Design a protein around this ligand. Structure first.
Ligand code: HEM
Ligand SMILES: C[C@]12CC[C@H](O)C[C@@H]1/C(=N/O)C[C@@H]1[C@@H]2CC[C@]2(C)C(c3cccnc3)=CC[C@@H]12
Length: 466
């Protein structure tokens, strides 16, 4: 009897299980590197730290491109900005200027610590009014980090109850949900095969965001002083007047860069905060010691500063541990080969798509002890007196040309938020018995199912007010 003709073949089922984990499972059969061909596009997947650092660092310039996608084109205004732009003059320029702006907050008046703590304070006040109740903390946190990133881009911040915050929240959730059904890595291109209204919806959410950026520019346009350079829109409008690289600083090119920064700044930070609280509800023992640590090394004489990350070591290890278990980007932003190159001495043609399975690096059992468990202790020496780096297979913020540019902002944000809340609130399981599911929801960002927290002001915090 003959075998039957085979038109196509995929190694696992679509839309079954998370993509980053189905790839990681295949490595038992095929090794840490393998490829898939979808028509003419060929995709290479990589799930070992040595091969990944070759792609990201050693040959980082050979694989610094970005593939083209229908949804990303719409959300990137046709591959402008940074995250979704291909490697070239536009991406080079805007990435540098964005990195350059972050320098404007090292210390002084707008010391990033000051801006951040200004909004955490307002955050804690609004939360303290819910003393005794179970709430979803997504939106209060959303507002806090929305204002930090707004002060950094525009030197403006939204007053309490500004409906424009709810409008931003709305299209942020619309874009994220239509950008990709699950992760950005989809074997089958479904939206080109079946009749669907996906791109129509994405265009309409994008339209509301873009029309909002145009209005924000036009007012700032008639307020820009070439001597005042206090934010990112200044840094970007400055470089424009100098070009008269004028072609790559058009109004849209600036629009899209601010967009990638405003977006990333809110959605990544908010997501990691929710993940952290969720893990601590499942891990009361760790939470208790976090209270102990912050009470011993900060007490209640003052509110926590960046300085405290030298003595609040367990809180640092908890943040590092969430970024390992539930990376914001378990497969990063897909890369592309700008030229013919190789990985582990394997041929890789120009234009090939390359994906680093960061989920695989963070769960490699030869590199981590019990990687499925949430053990912040793994980042502490056995005595708990100094942070460590237990595995080289650890890259929450990526590496190389395409690495995160908001890491400094991110780490300071996550630390100050968690330190202020733990100093001040008992964060307990709601009165109903429900805990948050840690399974997660893979989108362009690795989100968690929304959940509620019973929040109480700490008795230790009430005392010391006398
Ligand atoms: C815990 C928080 C965060 C994590 C874990 C994280 C991680 C990452 C990763 C893994 C990448 C790309 C890796 C790759 O493509 O090779 C990336 C890129 C990027 N991140 Fe984040 N990030 C975080 C927060 C932020 C924040 C707060 C900002 C604020 C501006 C930001 C802005 C960006 C941008 C613009 C890119 C694109 C880089 C490029 O394409 O060259 N990220 N981040
Ligand atoms: C999609 C978006 C969040 C929703 C906004 O309405 C549009 C944002 C964007 N405009 O198209 C830029 C995206 C951001 C989502 C997060 C992104 C993809 C991001 C990132 C993602 C994961 C880790 N670090 C950074 C870079 C661009 C950021």
């Amino acid at each position: 009897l003959l075998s039957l003709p085979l038109v196509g073949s995929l190694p696992f089922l679509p839309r079954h299980g998370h993509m980053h984990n189905n790839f990681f499972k295949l490595q038992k059969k095929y090794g840490p590197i393998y490829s898939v061909r979808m028509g003419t596009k060929t995709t290479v997947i990589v799930g070992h730290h040595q091969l990944a650092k070759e792609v990201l660092i050693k040959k980082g310039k050979d694989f610094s491109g970005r593939p083209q996608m229908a949804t990303l084109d719409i959300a990137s205004n046709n591959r402008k900005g940074i995250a979704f732009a291909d490697s070239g003059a536009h991406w080079q320029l805007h990435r540098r200027l964005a990195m350059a702006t972050f320098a404007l907050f090292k210390d002084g008046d707008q010391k990033l610590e000051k801006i951040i703590c200004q909004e955490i304070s307002t955050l804690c006040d609004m939360l303290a009014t819910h003393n005794g109740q179970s709430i979803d903390i997504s939106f209060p946190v959303f507002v806090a980090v929305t204002n930090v990133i707004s002060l950094i881009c525009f030197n403006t911040s939204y007053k309490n109850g500004d409906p424009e915050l709810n409008v931003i929240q709305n299209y942020n959730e619309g874009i994220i949900d239509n950008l990709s059904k699950d992760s950005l890595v989809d074997l089958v291109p479904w939206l080109k095969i079946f009749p669907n209204k996906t791109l129509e919806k994405l265009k309409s959410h994008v339209k509301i965001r873009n029309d909002l950026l145009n209005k924000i520019l036009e007012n700032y346009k008639e307020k820009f002083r070439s001597d005042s350079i206090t934010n990112m829109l200044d840094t970007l409008m400055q470089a424009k007047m100098n070009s008269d690289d004028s072609e790559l600083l058009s109004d849209n090119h600036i629009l899209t860069t601010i967009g990638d920064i405003f977006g990333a700044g809110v959605e990544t930070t908010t997501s990691v905060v929710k993940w952290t609280l969720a893990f601590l509800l499942h891990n009361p023992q760790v939470k208790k010691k976090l209270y102990e640590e912050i009470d011993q090394n900060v007490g209640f004489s003052r509110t926590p500063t960046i300085s405290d990350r030298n003595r609040l070591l367990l809180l640092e290890a908890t943040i590092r541990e969430v970024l390992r278990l539930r990376p914001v980007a378990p497969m990063l932003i897909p890369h592309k080969a700008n030229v013919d190159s190789s990985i582990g001495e394997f041929a890789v043609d120009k234009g090939t798509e390359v994906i680093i399975n960061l989920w695989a690096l963070h769960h490699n059992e030869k590199e981590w002890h019990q990687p499925d468990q949430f053990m912040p202790e793994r980042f502490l020496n056995p005595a708990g007196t100094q942070l460590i780096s237990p595995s080289v297979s650890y890259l929450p913020f990526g590496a190389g040309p395409r690495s995160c540019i908001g890491e400094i902002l991110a780490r300071q944000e996550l630390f100050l938020i968690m330190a202020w809340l733990l100093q001040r609130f008992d964060l307990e399981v709601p009165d109903d018995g429900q805990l948050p599911s840690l399974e997660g929801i893979p989108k362009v960002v690795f989100l968690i199912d929304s959940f509620k927290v019973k929040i109480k002001v700490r008795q230790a915090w009430r005392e010391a007010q006398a």
